[PDB]
């Protein structure tokens, strides 16, 4: 068995080319003008970590819940090419404001038989995911979960119902019409676009047992979306991300220390100590914890026949709150910075266990129907 690394991870790549710097300046300014935001500042929302107080939040307001997809969070911008105004252009950009130009993509306009009209000043929020099919068939897909602007009109002040509603009618529906009668053309698309399916807030058990295990892309927990709130740029206290403790991983520097016995030479077959270190900055590392490795686990690590010491590893906390090896991270310059470590640990400390989340569901649902009067 080869040593597990990030090379095992199904990697999602934005199917496009980085837009040139001068083009990006135009796009940022243009987006800022429409939204009323700041050009250099990402206008998308960011969720907060689910904590204990959020059990009451779900009890007080209408919420949707869906699977938190593994993939890349991207906003989609339909506009004209900054250099060629006669050229329709689609951009996907992330929270670091990296703009990618996507080609061979097509978003039809309603009731247009020419297929030459196009959308401008339209901004979607969603996630690019990679669905796996049998025979190594892979399908890139853009799951839409919000709309900031459609056809020149900003919908950020409206609630989720109107926001997703306008996207479904003006974008998805005509696209659905086109796709049904143009499967040959559709296959050229770098990715397929669809509205992300959501459940009522109290329906997480259905997600756990029926939806999630049938997914064709990576899952990373749950996202809760309030339906009584406007779109918020930046940190949105109404938008909640929930993750099991095992998914709240941290990258450490691993060091092995073998005990020198009183008499004779060191038995290197014997279990050493597994020290986990945290990056303090530059080249400074400090001791943080011991990694728990059982006897059979130690045999597997030896079976890898790769260097174990002085390496970045990804670790998680088990049921007994012991740090456990998950995979090597050869894609990292350093371990997680102490500030990042503290932040992840805080999400866990304030966290709600899966069990406690489920036991709260009846109360949540009950209050949902008592609001429905």
UniProtKB/Swiss-Prot annotation:
Underlying gene: ceg1
GO BP term, example: 7-methylguanosine mRNA capping
Family matches, as PANTHER family: MRNA-CAPPING ENZYME
One family name in Pfam for this protein: mRNA_cap_C
UniProt protein name: mRNA-capping enzyme subunit alpha
Subunit structure: Heterodimer. The mRNA-capping enzyme is composed of two separate chains alpha and beta, respectively a mRNA guanylyltransferase and an mRNA 5'-triphosphate monophosphatase.
GO cellular component, one term: nucleus
Reaction it catalyzes: a 5'-end diphospho-ribonucleoside in mRNA + GTP + H(+) = a 5'-end (5'-triphosphoguanosine)-ribonucleoside in mRNA + diphosphate
InterPro entries: mRNA_cap_enzyme_adenylation, mRNA_cap_enzyme_alpha, mRNA_cap_enzyme_C, mRNA_Capping_Enz/RNA_Phosphat, NA-bd_OB-fold
Cell compartment(s), UniProt: Nucleus
Function per UniProt: Second step of mRNA capping. Transfer of the GMP moiety of GTP to the 5'-end of RNA via an enzyme-GMP covalent reaction intermediate.
Keywords attached to this entry: GTP-binding, mRNA capping, mRNA processing, Nucleotide-binding, Nucleotidyltransferase, Nucleus, Transferase
Enzyme class: transferase
Molecular function (Gene Ontology), one example: ATP binding
Active site: 68 (n6-gmp-lysine intermediate)
Family: Belongs to the eukaryotic GTase family.
Originating organism: Schizosaccharomyces pombe (strain 972 / ATCC 24843)
Entry's EC annotation: 2.7.7.50
